[PDB]
Amino acid sequence: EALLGVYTNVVEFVKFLETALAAACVNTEFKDLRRMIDGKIQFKISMPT
């Protein structure tokens, strides 16, 4: 006698680009980030008098 069961699905959630939190961050898809050691940003601020 073959028996069947009832399974309920995993409740899916709104993705990251579809929330309003991404208005605070700038999103890029860096494909190979496990190869990166460091990443730097360099500012150069000239100051008037």
Contact set with another protein (CB under 8 A): 47-49
Cβ proximity to another protein: between 5 and 48 the closer is 48
- Of 17 and 47, which CB lies nearer to another protein in the complex structure? 47
What's the CA gap between 40 and 21, in Å, rounded? 24
- Give residue for tokens 């000239």: 46
In the complex, what is the shortest distance from the CB of residue 47 to another protein, in angstroms, rounded to a whole number?
Answer: 7
Task: Indicate the residue among 7 and 43 with the shorter CB distance to another protein.
Answer: 43
- Measured distance CA(43)–CA(41) in Å, rounded: 7
Q: What is the DSSP letter of 15?
A: -
